[PDB]
């Protein structure tokens with residue numbers, strides 16, 4: 001089977017704005033998670049062809065990864081911080097859905113998620 005197209009990261013028809021929350025989501029949240037020791041399987045869309053995961057896209061219908069989230073923040077694709085937070089949550093839950101409790105990839109996702117939740121609990125109030 002083929003991989004689906006990646007999630008859209010840019011759209012010239014969507015309106016754009018700059019907020020302190022979206023700035024914090026790129027500057028603090030994504031930059032911190034990106035450097036984490038267990039971030040590398042989550043830095044690009046799951047390549048089910050190269051990774052030999054033929055049922056991945058039969059089970060995961062809403063794929064999401066940090067490479068996509070970063071490109072969306074860098075392209076001013078998100079209007080609300082909540083859209084970015086939901087993408088981080090979709091990424092984690094996809095991993096828990098496809099994999100099983102105790103799998104190393106799940107342990108890796110759980111560690112990035114705990115860090116994510118710490119940095120999101122310190123999200124600055126909207127200026």
Ligand SMILES: C[C@@H]1C(=O)N(C)CCN1CCOc1ccc(C2CCN(c3ccc4nnc(Cl)n4n3)CC2)cc1
Nearest residue numbers: 041042046047051053056094095096098099104105108
């Ligand atoms: C479906 C799934 C997914 O959810 N995502 C998002 C992308 C990935 N993908 C497929 C699964 O990928 C994985 C990517 C990385 C790993 C880790 C597991 C832990 N570790 C080890 C462990 C023991 C060991 N002994 N000697 C070496 Cl060396 N090691 N290294 C490094 C590689 C596991 C699965």
